[PDB]
Design an enzyme around this catalytic site. Structure first.
Site, PDB file in Angstrom:
ATOM      1  N   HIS A  96       0.805  -1.219   0.000  1.00 34.91           N
ATOM      2  CA  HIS A  96       0.000   0.000   0.000  1.00 34.91           C
ATOM      3  C   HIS A  96       0.845   1.279   0.000  1.00 34.91           C
ATOM      4  O   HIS A  96       0.271   2.354  -0.130  1.00 34.91           O
ATOM      5  CB  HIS A  96      -1.074   0.036   1.100  1.00 34.91           C
ATOM      6  CG  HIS A  96      -0.570   0.121   2.516  1.00 34.91           C
ATOM      7  ND1 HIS A  96      -0.178   1.326   3.075  1.00 34.91           N
ATOM      8  CD2 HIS A  96      -0.554  -0.828   3.480  1.00 34.91           C
ATOM      9  CE1 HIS A  96       0.119   1.060   4.341  1.00 34.91           C
ATOM     10  NE2 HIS A  96      -0.089  -0.223   4.632  1.00 34.91           N
ATOM     11  N   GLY A 134       2.211   5.977  10.476  1.00 34.50           N
ATOM     12  CA  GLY A 134       3.626   5.843  10.152  1.00 34.50           C
ATOM     13  C   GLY A 134       4.257   4.547  10.639  1.00 34.50           C
ATOM     14  O   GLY A 134       5.426   4.277  10.354  1.00 34.50           O
ATOM     15  N   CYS A 193       3.251   1.451   9.790  1.00 35.47           N
ATOM     16  CA  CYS A 193       3.135   0.426   8.732  1.00 35.47           C
ATOM     17  C   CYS A 193       4.505  -0.057   8.296  1.00 35.47           C
ATOM     18  O   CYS A 193       5.385   0.772   8.074  1.00 35.47           O
ATOM     19  CB  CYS A 193       2.335   0.942   7.537  1.00 35.47           C
ATOM     20  SG  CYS A 193       0.607   1.364   7.907  1.00 35.47           S
TER      21      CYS A 193
HETATM   22  C1  LIG Z   1      -7.403   4.087  11.222  1.00 31.84           C
HETATM   23  N1  LIG Z   1      -6.792   4.442   9.953  1.00 31.84           N
HETATM   24  C2  LIG Z   1      -7.466   5.053   8.983  1.00 31.84           C
HETATM   25  O1  LIG Z   1      -8.635   5.407   9.116  1.00 31.84           O
HETATM   26  C3  LIG Z   1      -6.732   5.273   7.669  1.00 31.84           C
HETATM   27  N2  LIG Z   1      -6.000   4.096   7.198  1.00 31.84           N
HETATM   28  C4  LIG Z   1      -6.588   3.474   6.002  1.00 31.84           C
HETATM   29  C5  LIG Z   1      -5.827   2.239   5.571  1.00 31.84           C
HETATM   30  C6  LIG Z   1      -6.438   1.299   4.743  1.00 31.84           C
HETATM   31  C7  LIG Z   1      -5.793   0.125   4.395  1.00 31.84           C
HETATM   32  C8  LIG Z   1      -4.521  -0.100   4.866  1.00 31.84           C
HETATM   33 CL1  LIG Z   1      -3.731  -1.608   4.500  1.00 31.84          CL
HETATM   34  C9  LIG Z   1      -3.870   0.822   5.662  1.00 31.84           C
HETATM   35  C10 LIG Z   1      -4.523   1.998   6.035  1.00 31.84           C
HETATM   36  C11 LIG Z   1      -3.830   2.994   6.950  1.00 31.84           C
HETATM   37  C12 LIG Z   1      -3.725   2.394   8.354  1.00 31.84           C
HETATM   38  O2  LIG Z   1      -4.579   1.635   8.803  1.00 31.84           O
HETATM   39  N3  LIG Z   1      -2.700   2.878   9.091  1.00 31.84           N
HETATM   40  C13 LIG Z   1      -2.422   2.645  10.456  1.00 31.84           C
HETATM   41  C14 LIG Z   1      -1.833   1.481  10.945  1.00 31.84           C
HETATM   42  N4  LIG Z   1      -1.592   1.224  12.239  1.00 31.84           N
HETATM   43  C15 LIG Z   1      -1.932   2.148  13.124  1.00 31.84           C
HETATM   44  C16 LIG Z   1      -2.553   3.374  12.791  1.00 31.84           C
HETATM   45  C17 LIG Z   1      -2.979   4.310  13.760  1.00 31.84           C
HETATM   46  C18 LIG Z   1      -3.613   5.452  13.370  1.00 31.84           C
HETATM   47  S1  LIG Z   1      -4.071   6.629  14.606  1.00 31.84           S
HETATM   48  C19 LIG Z   1      -5.800   6.410  14.797  1.00 31.84           C
HETATM   49  O3  LIG Z   1      -3.834   7.944  14.078  1.00 31.84           O
HETATM   50  O4  LIG Z   1      -3.425   6.265  15.836  1.00 31.84           O
HETATM   51  C20 LIG Z   1      -3.863   5.726  12.031  1.00 31.84           C
HETATM   52  C21 LIG Z   1      -3.463   4.846  11.069  1.00 31.84           C
HETATM   53  C22 LIG Z   1      -2.802   3.638  11.412  1.00 31.84           C
HETATM   54  C23 LIG Z   1      -4.574   4.332   6.979  1.00 31.84           C
END
Ligand SMILES: CNC(=O)CN1Cc2ccc(Cl)cc2[C@H](C(=O)Nc2cncc3cc(S(C)(=O)=O)ccc23)C1
Ligand SMILES: CNC(=O)CN1Cc2ccc(Cl)cc2[C@H](C(=O)Nc2cncc3cc(S(C)(=O)=O)ccc23)C1
Ligand SMILES: [Cl-]
Lengths: 297, 305
Positions: A41, A135, A137
Site C-alpha cells: 500500500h 507511520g 506500517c
Molecule cells: C485508522 N486508519 C485510517 O482510518 C486510515 N488508514 C486506512 C488504511 C487502509 C488500508 C490499509 Cl492496509 C492501511 C490503512 C492505513 C492504516 O490503517 N494505518 C495505520 C496502521 N496502524 C496504526 C494506525 C494508527 C492510526 S491513529 C488512529 O492515528 O493512531 C492511524 C493509522 C494507522 C490508513
C-alpha cells in the site's frame, strides 16, 4: 523471581529497519541482503498502480544514507524492492507463518527509526492488540531461536476497534482482511486457554498456589465450561505441550484445568495472580519455560 | 491507537554486554570504551556475603584473576578499581560498539527498560519502574547480576540501573552506574527487607489521561477536589502523596484533554472507592502505575479520540 511480559532483544532487527517513501506515503521497510520488504500500500488495482512506477519513484533511506532501487516486484500484499547494496547487518533469518495463540516481539518504527519494542500474541481472531500510530506500517514481528531471527509479521493497518492487522513476510494476511479502505471488522475474540494454563503454572512456580484445589476433570467436561466463557477449545495437543510444566510442579494438566474452571465460575475474590486481576493469555507454554529457565541470544 | 508497556529498542545496550568471571562467580558486565563495569560482589564467595570486606578481598586480586569475555573474544584486564558498589575493570580494547551515553541516577516513580542477561548474553527486554520503596519488580534468575536498566532518548543511552540482588520477597535491588544503591540496601546478605510499597499516584493519573486520549471516559465524574483532601483519601489506599510538582508535570496532559488535574484526582478518588465493576481501563482491571507522564506523551498521539 518476578514475571514480566518479555520481548526478545531487538538489536538484530534494528539493523534492518529502513524508511520507504513513494509519492506522499512514507512507511517502514525491512532490508535483508539486497532486498527491502514493505507493505504494497506504499504505492486499488495494485498491478495497475505498480506498472506505472519506476525504480527512482521509490526513495529508500537507511539512517542518513540513500539506497538506490534497481528493481521491484510484488508478492501477495508485500512489495520487494531490489536495492544496489546488501545490508551488512543482515542477521541469520527465516520467514515463518505463525498460528493464533503464538507470541512474538514487535519492533515499532516510524520513518525507518525504531521507537519501541513490545511482546504480543496473534489473537484467535487473527488481529494483534498492538500499540501503533500513523507511520508504523512496515513495523515487524519476530522471534529469535539462538542466533536466527524468524520474521513472522509485517504491520499493514488499524481496524476501527483499535486492533491491528498485517501479513506474514510473504505478503499473506493473517485473518480475513484486505489491504484497502472498506468495512472491515475484527471477529469476536476468544481467550487462548493453553496460554492461560501456562501462566497459572508460572504463578505456581513463583509461589502463588491459592487457586489450586484437590479436584480433577475430564477434557470433555472442561471444554463445555471453556465454550461458555468464550475460551478456545483445549485439545490433546495443548495437554501434551503443557507436559513439562505439569511435571515440574507436580500438578496434572487436568488438575490445573479444574482450578481454571473454578476461577471462571467464581472469579478471583479480591485476589491477584502474578500481580494481575485478569487471567493472562499472552504467554505460551514455551515463553513460561524460557523465562523461568534463562535462555540467552 | 492501543496502549502497551513498551521498552526501548535494546540494540545499543546488547553491543555492550560482556561476561565477567572471578574465581567461581560469573556475572554480567557493561563494556563502554575501555572500561567494563560490574557488581563488586563478583570478587566474593557465598560465605563472604555475610560480612564481606571488599577492600580486603580486592587488594588480594591481580588483573589476570578477572576473566572478561565479549562474545567469543577474551578481553585483557590491565587495571581495576572500585567505585562504591561497582568494580571498574580497565581493558586493553575500547568497545567499537560504544554508543553515545550518560550515567543518570533516577528517582522513584521513573521508568526504564531492562536488558536481562546471563553469561554476558542478553535473553530478554522489559519495561519497569523504580518503586517508591526503591526496589524494582523485575524478572531475574541466578546469573542476572550486572544486567542493566536504561532509557534511550534520541540516540543517547542513559544508563540508570545495574542489578545486584534479589530480596526475600522476590523484588530486586541494585545501584546507579556510579555504584550507589537505590534504597537502604547493602551488597551484603543480611536481614534486608523492602519497605512497605506504595502506588505511584502521578503515574496512575497519567495513565487515566492516556485512557481519555484513547477514547475512554466512563470513570470521569462531575466533582473536583483540593490537593490536601485528595492526599488524605489516597494515603488510605497506600498511594504516594501527590505534590505540586506532580500537578505541574501533568499540565500538558490536562491541557490536551481539557480535564484539570484536580478533576482527574476526583475520578481517581472515586475509582478507589468503587473499584471497576467489571470494566477495564486500557485492557486492565487494576490501576496501572508504571507509565510516567512523559511515557504517555511519548506513546500516545497529540490528537485525542
Ligand atoms: C485508522 N486508519 C485510517 O482510518 C486510515 N488508514 C486506512 C488504511 C487502509 C488500508 C490499509 Cl492496509 C492501511 C490503512 C492505513 C492504516 O490503517 N494505518 C495505520 C496502521 N496502524 C496504526 C494506525 C494508527 C492510526 S491513529 C488512529 O492515528 O493512531 C492511524 C493509522 C494507522 C490508513
Ligand atoms: C535470593 N538470593 C539468594 O538466594 C542468593 N543471593 C544472595 C545475594 C546477596 C547479596 C547480593 Cl549483593 C547478591 C546476592 C546474590 C543474588 O541475590 N542474586 C540474584 C539476583 N537476581 C535474581 C536472583 C534470583 C534468584 S532465584 C531465587 O533462583 O530466582 C537467585 C539469586 C538472584 C545471591
Ligand atoms: Cl528521574
Amino acid at each position: 523471581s518476578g514475571f514480566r511480559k518479555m520481548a526478545f532483544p531487538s538489536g538484530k532487527v534494528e539493523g534492518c529497519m529502513v524508511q520507504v517513501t513513494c509519492g506522499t506515503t512514507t512507511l517502514n521497510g525491512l532490508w535483508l541482503d539486497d532486498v527491502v520488504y514493505c507493505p504494497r500500500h506504499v504505492i486499488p488495482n495494485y498491478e495497475d498502480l505498480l506498472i506505472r512506477k519506476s525504480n527512482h519513484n521509490f526513495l529508500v533511506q537507511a539512517g542518513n544514507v540513500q539506497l538506490r532501487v534497481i528493481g521491484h516486484s510484488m508478492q501477495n500484499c508485500v512489495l520487494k524492492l531490489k536495492v544496489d547494496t546488501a545490508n551488512p547487518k543482515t542477521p541469520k533469518y527465516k520467514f515463518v507463518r505463525i498460528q493464533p495463540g503464538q507470541t512474538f516481539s514487535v519492533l515499532a518504527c516510524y520513518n525507518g527509526s525504531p521507537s519501541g519494542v513490545y511482546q504480543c500474541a496473534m489473537r484467535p481472531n487473527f488481529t494483534i492488540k498492538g500499540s501503533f500510530l500513523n507511520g508504523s506500517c512496515g513495523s515487524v514481528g519476530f522471534n529469535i531461536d539462538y542466533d536466527c531471527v524468524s520474521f513472522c509479521y509485517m504491520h499493514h493497518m488499524e481496524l476501527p476497534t483499535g486492533v491491528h492487522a498485517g501479513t506474514d513476510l510473504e505478503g499473506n494476511f493473517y485473518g480475513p482482511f484486505v489491504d484497502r479502505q472498506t468495512a472491515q471488522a475484527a471477529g469476536t475474540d476468544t481467550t487462548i486457554t493453553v496460554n492461560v494454563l501456562a501462566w497459572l503454572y508460572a504463578a505456581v512456580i513463583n509461589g502463588d498456589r491459592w487457586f489450586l484445589n484437590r479436584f480433577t476433570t475430564t477434557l470433555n467436561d472442561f471444554n463445555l465450561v471453556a465454550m461458555k466463557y468464550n475460551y478456545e477449545p483445549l485439545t490433546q495437543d495443548h495437554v501434551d505441550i503443557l507436559g513439562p510444566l505439569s511435571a515440574q510442579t507436580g500438578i496434572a494438566v487436568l488438575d490445573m484445568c479444574a482450578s481454571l474452571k473454578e476461577l471462571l465460575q467464581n472469579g478471583m475474590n479480591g485476589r491477584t495472580i502474578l500481580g494481575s486481576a485478569l487471567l493472562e493469555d499472552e504467554f505460551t507454554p514455551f515463553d513460561v519455560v524460557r523465562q523461568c529457565s534463562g535462555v540467552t541470544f
